[PDB]
Write a protein that binds this DNA or RNA. Structure first.
Ligand SMILES: [Zn+2]
Ligand SMILES: [Zn+2]
Ligand SMILES: [Zn+2]
Ligand SMILES: [Zn+2]
Lengths: 65, 65
DNA sequence: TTGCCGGTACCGGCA
DNA sequence: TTGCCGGTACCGGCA
């Protein structure tokens, strides 16, 4: 299937192929090419966007309590 | 100089040139091509990264107070 | 102080 | 339930 990272960037991951050797892209990056079949990319943008929104209110809370 | 957005993505902005008409890239995007000579791109990545770190502690605070 | 290139990081969709 | 292309969004640096 796809190495976590490649799954993250939805980029062609060539694991199975290039044997025990970590995924190619994970080369250039030189990172732990993990294989968690049950992994699903994080939607960074949207995510952090939520984060910031949340973190906001909290302050506006401190604007009171 | 450079339209805020182009400044944001550090991308060639062609304002002065293409007259009163909003910057080109700001076309594809169709956004308010503002010109705030005193603007400086936000470092999204690094930024939000700080945010998250901060927002974290706060919770670990709530893990007490 | 400030413009942009050359190169990743991300992602919306389309299989 | 997923692999990935095609197209932005971001940025580290080098002027
Ligand atoms: Zn891979
Ligand atoms: Zn890999
Ligand atoms: Zn522009
Ligand atoms: Zn513009």
């Amino acid at each position: 299937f796809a190495c976590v990272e490649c799954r993250q960037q939805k980029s062609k991951c060539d694991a199975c192929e290039r044997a025990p050797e970590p995924c190619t892209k994970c080369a250039k990056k030189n990172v732990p090419c993990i294989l968690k079949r049950d992994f699903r990319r994080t939607y960074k943008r949207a995510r952090n966007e939520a984060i910031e929104k949340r973190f906001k209110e909290l302050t506006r809370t401190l604007t009171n309590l």
